[PDB]
Amino acid sequence: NMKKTSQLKWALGENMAPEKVDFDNCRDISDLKQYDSDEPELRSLSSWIQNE
Amino acid sequence: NATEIRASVGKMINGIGRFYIQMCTELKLSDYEGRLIQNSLTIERMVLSAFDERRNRYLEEHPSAGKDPKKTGGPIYKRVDGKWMRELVLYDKEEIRRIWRQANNGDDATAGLTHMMIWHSNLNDTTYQRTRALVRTGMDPRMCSLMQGSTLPRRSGAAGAAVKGVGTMVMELIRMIKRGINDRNFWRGENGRKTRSAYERMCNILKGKFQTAAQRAMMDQVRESRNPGNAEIEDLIFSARSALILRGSVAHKSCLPACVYGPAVASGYDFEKEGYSLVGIDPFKLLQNSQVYSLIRPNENPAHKSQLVWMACHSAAFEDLRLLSFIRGTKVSPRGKLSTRGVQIASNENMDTMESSTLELRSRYQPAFSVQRNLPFDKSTIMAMRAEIIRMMEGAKPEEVSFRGRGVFELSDEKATNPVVPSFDMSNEGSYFF
Amino acid sequence: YMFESKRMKLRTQIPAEMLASIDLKYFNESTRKKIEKIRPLLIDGTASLS
RNA sequence: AGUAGAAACAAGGGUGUUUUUUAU
RNA sequence: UUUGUCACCCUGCU
């Protein structure tokens, strides 16, 4: 078991989920909106996939 | 700048003295009470409860048991004709509001609030031993003379930095983060702003406290850490052993209670004209020339109770006896060596057997002639910037506590002309907590 | 639906019962143009589907 | 940061206990 | 920051 150090939690993503609070309270805050539901970013072919 | 500061200090002194005076006059007390430490402390308590917002809140909520809401009071003592009598009344608070007022030219006075409460706080220090507290936190025993501000209120924007000893801050931080373990919202919450604010100021001031280039960076790292945890904790505790080896810039100074401000005023003197130096000779003089009454139970030497009163009223922070007993004419005997149970009186035990007595509040008094002293040669226990702090520990000159404050020379030497070479008797122990 | 605030790290759940009264300043364009076309059918959580 | 793609994950629930106290 | 000093359970498709 690895000790828990700063860089390891950073890399492994610990303590980074937002807090769960009700709608009765954070109803008068700005920048409050849906989760993002957009199409992914488009990309084009490269050469390494055939070589692999 | 400094002159104006001293003037304001003297003004607050005058104010506290008036306050004591008015309170006394009203209660219908007499000279004796003016010099009755117990009643003085009761009044101080009362006023302190009074100026507290969080306190007000909680009380208004559901005060329940205790004195009536909006008012309060303390165990106040008074001989009848033969023996002392301990009463208790819930003085109305408006009275208190108006008494501070007149006493302070209508100017709020939290500065002296903290002065005197520091006073009572360090007094309680001379008297109690918070051994458990340490391990209660997990810190493990640290035989130290610091943590003077360990048992004081929250608001000392400055006084805290002045007296809170590295240990106090370290302990606080340990619990801080610690609650940042047991709790998750401390950061997982909008409260996060306030929370980080606190962590940060503390970091800065505590890192600055000591004077070791090495750890300083370590503390910077500890601060830059978000979502703190155990590693941070181990770090801090060692560094605190390392502080045991490094002076906490925090420097303790000196205290004066309303009881003493009171006759200082009732007697005759101009405080607002000349601010009493909490780090100079003025308070010393006033005290040496001030009467005082301490109620004492049986099986308690008057030389030992006066000694206990001395340290607490000299801001000793469990200081070294090598000078403590110098600075004062008589020999200062170790804590475990004195017959006393503190100053505060409980309600659980007999009151008829209360001998009142007069407190002996008087005192007789590295290229510099003063020789700082360290007695830390327990590298073994020290072992119990890794190599940096290790080597700095290996062969260096540490110090439990440096009372560079309180110039105390020869009391006839009023502004430090003839530093009398100190003569320390190495026979007796150096730490108040041994 | 689930709403999020990037500035204060808050996530919250709103139930399908509030889809006839809630302010519309929280949804993207597709959700707005869906809600504002289904809104003439909402009756106590259900939706008329004949 | 990352997973992931039309909306989510990066944990989620309850139980406590509380007017200044002399010492190790 | 806090009226706190520290603990405790539970759950992994509900």
CA-wise closest residue to B176 among B125, B130, B244, B232 = B232
Got the DSSP string for A9-36? HHHHT-S-SPEE--TTTTTS-SSEEEPP
Q: How far is CA B362 from CA B125, B359, C46, in A?
A: 20, 9, 87
Rounded CA gap, B287 and B361, in Å?
6
What is the experimental method? cryo-EM
Q: How far is CA B187 from CA A16, B139, B154, B236, in A?
A: 10, 23, 21, 20
Partners of B77 in beta bridges: B86
Answer whether B227 sits within 8 Å of A19, measured CB to CB: no
Which chains have 3 or more CB–CB distances shorter than 8 Å to chain B?
A: A, C
Please give the single-letter amino acid code of residue B68.
Answer: D
DSSP, collapsed to helix, strand or coil, labels residue B402 as coil
For residue B150 the two structure tokens come to: 């360990």
CA-wise closest residue to B256 among B309, B201, B318 = B309
Chain C residue with minimum CA distance to A19: C10
Our measurement of CA B56 to C1' D21, in angstroms, reads: 23
Q: Which nucleotide is nearest to B57 (CA to C1')?
A: E3
The answer to whether B332 touches B429, Cβ cutoff 8 Å, is: no
Contacts of C10 in chain B (CB under 8 A): 190
Please give the single-letter amino acid code of residue B124.
Answer: N
CA-wise closest residue to B306 among B317, B318, B293 = B293
The answer to whether B148 touches B317, Cβ cutoff 8 Å, is: yes
Chain C contact for B70, CB < 8 A? Answer: no
DSSP H or E segment with residue B153: none
Partners of C13 in beta bridges: C2
Other beta carbons within 10 angstroms of residue B64's beta carbon come to 7
DSSP, collapsed to helix, strand or coil, labels residue B106 as coil
Chain A contact for B191, CB < 8 A? Answer: no
Q: How far is CA B54 from CA B51, B70, B154, B185, B360, in A?
A: 9, 14, 11, 22, 38
The answer to whether B252 touches B278, Cβ cutoff 8 Å, is: no
Rounded CA gap, B411 and B288, in Å?
10
Rounded CA gap, B8 and B19, in Å?
16
